[PDB]
Amino acid sequence: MLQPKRTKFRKMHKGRNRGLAQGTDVSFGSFGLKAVGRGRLTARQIEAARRAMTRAVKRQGKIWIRVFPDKPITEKPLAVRMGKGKGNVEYWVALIQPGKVLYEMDGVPEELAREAFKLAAAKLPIKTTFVTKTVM
Amino acid sequence: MFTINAEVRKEQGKGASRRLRAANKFPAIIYGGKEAPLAIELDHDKVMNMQAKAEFYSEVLTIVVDGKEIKVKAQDVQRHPYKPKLQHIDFVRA
Amino acid sequence: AKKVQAYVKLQVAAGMANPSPPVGPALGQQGVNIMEFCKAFNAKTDSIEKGLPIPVVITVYADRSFTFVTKTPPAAVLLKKAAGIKSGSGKPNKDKVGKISRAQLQEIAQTKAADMTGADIEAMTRSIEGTARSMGLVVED
Amino acid sequence: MKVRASVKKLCRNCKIVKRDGVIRVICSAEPKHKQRQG
Amino acid sequence: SRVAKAPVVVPAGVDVKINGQVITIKGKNGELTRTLNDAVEVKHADNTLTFGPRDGYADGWAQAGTARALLNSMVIGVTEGFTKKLQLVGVGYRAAVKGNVINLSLGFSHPVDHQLPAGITAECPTQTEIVLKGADKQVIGQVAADLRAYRRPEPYKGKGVRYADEVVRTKEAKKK
RNA sequence: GUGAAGAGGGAAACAACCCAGACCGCCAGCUAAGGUCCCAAAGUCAUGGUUAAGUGGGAAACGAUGUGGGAAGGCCCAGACAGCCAGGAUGUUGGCUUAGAAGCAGCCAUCAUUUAAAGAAAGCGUAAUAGCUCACUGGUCGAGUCGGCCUGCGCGGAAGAU
RNA sequence: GAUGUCGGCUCAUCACAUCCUGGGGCUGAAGUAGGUCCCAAGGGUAUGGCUGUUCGCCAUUUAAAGUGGUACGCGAGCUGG
Numbered sequence: 001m002l003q004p005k006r007t008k009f010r011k012m013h014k015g016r017n018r019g020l021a022q023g024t025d026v027s028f029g030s031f032g033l034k035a036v037g038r039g040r041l042t043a044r045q046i047e048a049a050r051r052a053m054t055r056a057v058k059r060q061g062k063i064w065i066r067v068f069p070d071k072p073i074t075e076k077p078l079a080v081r082m083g084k085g086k087g088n089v090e091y092w093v094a095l096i097q098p099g100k101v102l103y104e105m106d107g108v109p110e111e112l113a114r115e116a117f118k119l120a121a122a123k124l125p126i127k128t129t130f131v132t133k134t135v136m
Numbered sequence: 137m138f139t140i141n142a143e144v145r146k147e148q149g150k151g152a153s154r155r156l157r158a159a160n161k162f163p164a165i166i167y168g169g170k171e172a173p174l175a176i177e178l179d180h181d182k183v184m185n186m187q188a189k190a191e192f193y194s195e196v197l198t199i200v201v202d203g204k205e206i207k208v209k210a211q212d213v214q215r216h217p218y219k220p221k222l223q224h225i226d227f228v229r230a
Numbered sequence: 231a232k233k234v235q236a237y238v239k240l241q242v243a244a245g246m247a248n249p250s251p252p253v254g255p256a257l258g259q260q261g262v263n264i265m266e267f268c269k270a271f272n273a274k275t276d277s278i279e280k281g282l283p284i285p286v287v288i289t290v291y292a293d294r295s296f297t298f299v300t301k302t303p304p305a306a307v308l309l310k311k312a313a314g315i316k317s318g319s320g321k322p323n324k325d326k327v328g329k330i331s332r333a334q335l336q337e338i339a340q341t342k343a344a345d346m347t348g349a350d351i352e353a354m355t356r357s358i359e360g361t362a363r364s365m366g367l368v369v370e371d
Numbered sequence: 372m373k374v375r376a377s378v379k380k381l382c383r384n385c386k387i388v389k390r391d392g393v394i395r396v397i398c399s400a401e402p403k404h405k406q407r408q409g
Numbered sequence: 410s411r412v413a414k415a416p417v418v419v420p421a422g423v424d425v426k427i428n429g430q431v432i433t434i435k436g437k438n439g440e441l442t443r444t445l446n447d448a449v450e451v452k453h454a455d456n457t458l459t460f461g462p463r464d465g466y467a468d469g470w471a472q473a474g475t476a477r478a479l480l481n482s483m484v485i486g487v488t489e490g491f492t493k494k495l496q497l498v499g500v501g502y503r504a505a506v507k508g509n510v511i512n513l514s515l516g517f518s519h520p521v522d523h524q525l526p527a528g529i530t531a532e533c534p535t536q537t538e539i540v541l542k543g544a545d546k547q548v549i550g551q552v553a554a555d556l557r558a559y560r561r562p563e564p565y566k567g568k569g570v571r572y573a574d575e576v577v578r579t580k581e582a583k584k585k
Numbered sequence: 586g587u588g589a590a591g592a593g594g595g596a597a598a599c600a601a602c603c604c605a606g607a608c609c610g611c612c613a614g615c616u617a618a619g620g621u622c623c624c625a626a627a628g629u630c631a632u633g634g635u636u637a638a639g640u641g642g643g644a645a646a647c648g649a650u651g652u653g654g655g656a657a658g659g660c661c662c663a664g665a666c667a668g669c670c671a672g673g674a675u676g677u678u679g680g681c682u683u684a685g686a687a688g689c690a691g692c693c694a695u696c697a698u699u700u701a702a703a704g705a706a707a708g709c710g711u712a713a714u715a716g717c718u719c720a721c722u723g724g725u726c727g728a729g730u731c732g733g734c735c736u737g738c739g740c741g742g743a744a745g746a747u
Numbered sequence: 748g749a750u751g752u753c754g755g756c757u758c759a760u761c762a763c764a765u766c767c768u769g770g771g772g773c774u775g776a777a778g779u780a781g782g783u784c785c786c787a788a789g790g791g792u793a794u795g796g797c798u799g800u801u802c803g804c805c806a807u808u809u810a811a812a813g814u815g816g817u818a819c820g821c822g823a824g825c826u827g828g
Binding site: 231232233234235238239240241242246249251252253254255256257282283285304305306307310318319320321322323324339342345346347348349353354356357358359360361362363364365366 | 674675676677678679680681682684685687692693694695696697698699705709710711713714715716717
């Protein structure tokens, strides 16, 4: 998994929130993936996605990162009676909402960007969809 | 440049707004200067394909409302947050 | 496979027309004869320059006969000579390893002229210029 | 045949034939590109 | 569209019956058809056995473009034979001919055989070849398949009863 | 909020869900939730459309000229789209690597000419060339056509124990 | 206000994600046996040494000695390790 480099608390509520995010559209790159689904990324998924993306666009592209896991959440091992104490941080989730931008490519063809994002998400569970900045 | 067909909208509130969009008619306003704002409803399908092109956001549009013409520019554009579908577009006069 | 037409084109230097394998079993099969072709070839190569494979066009016939026109040494080889570094150009257009003047290109175009296509001598000169640019040998004259 | 659940593309001579409710591949260049389903 | 709007033809020396949805030709050198269609509209002219899209369908014009070529292919099914060779790689496979039996084997202890249907004529002088020359493009094509389907060309050798094409590559044998 | 402490009607039956709170009787009438092909009371109702999997009547990642509707774009009688006639030339079987890799192991060139069109090339083949075929392009043909987009309904994916 | 735990024995029965036989696809498929994957439950699916082990390890066979459910099947049938 992937985790913060600085913290202030070491456990966090699972958190239930409604849809929509402020970052709805790209504001740097000319391409992106926004979200259609919602859920939580374990953070091995974010790791796999980054990997797959890079291998395609090569060093031609230009990268911007959004979505940061920062909610830890604990997991109690098997053979432990639930609701007696609380487990150890074995999650590092990023609560995601519809329209949440993932990554952002630029400096590449539209086709190349699509088939780096196609490789990325497919190791991210939610359905995604292509973004073209246009001029806005 | 797109020369686009719209008409006055006298139907307001979220309920009516939602209802409107299903009939391919999405709310919108023209405003500019100290002239009165014109609450119109453009046609979804038409504007959808037009706004896909960058021409829309960067050239004088001419929205024919009630046999008159108003020269505007498309300023802000409030899209659906995971579909290329629209929900509203703010127009600031040119 | 090893099927081949009777109008072959091949490059061989002297003493590499003597074996059948680097010309391929392919055209060895035909009415062109390895032995015959070798000694005939190697005679005429003495007068001309050599250093890299030399393009000869053999026209085979079905009576076990053949005729061949041995062309003048390649445009590439001639350009290498002009540039003063020969035995290939390594990997072209990733380094510079020659210089070629407008004068050199014109000379080479006139010598190769017979075997070339081109509207004018000018057309042919540009063809040789494209070979220089393809060998990574710059033209800055 | 060999179960592969995504047709993709493997050759230009992959015809991509829909026979029954499945979409198999018959390929006459290489029999390796055949698959049962899609 | 295309085929389904191209004009049907009944060639000279061929004749047709009045049918509701059956395709039946008569005469000679074209006198056997028995195929059914189930969304044609069997209308007539004097040289066009016409087909259209039957009521209760909206894809009945598929059946019409079918019926067109299907008629025309059994005019020349009878007139012209098919499977005029059917060769084979591999020795000991051979054939024999009795003018209505044609033997085949792959080196089998007992030869396998096809007793050719009525109206289907076959013989051959070459005994690694099977020459059919009977009636109906379909009929012939079925019997043709039964031959070659015992052993087919391989993608490292090509051994196996062929027809008129092979799929083979020069894959490297292992255990060498 | 209900059950607890509430029956009745509906959810196949199923305390907790949905409808509606039973003073009592009457082989009375009108409705609710929910239903109207038969078992089993009432529409094989009217109007229009969609769907062929028995979908409806368990499933997702994901895959697919499935099929219906809408808008836009590319191409089209100055000839598109399929097929068919061809062109497939030349400097140049270019260079590194290798005796020989000289379009097509890997690496580099991937320019220019001939032109209506013709890549120093997509694969088969050869260590690799040679050859075969090909995205590339002209003629013939004779009328519509090619992919995305929004969107409805289907399809595959879909294996278990009396 | 009692539903006898596990294992074996004995007797089974069902499911298929199939170990074997039957039918195939692909193969780097030389033949030869195979490898891999698909269809298939009709039938068939080893004896001993040690250990209560279910299981495992080992020995030697066989076409193969499948896997799981059935109160980790079967004590108002047996044993009581």
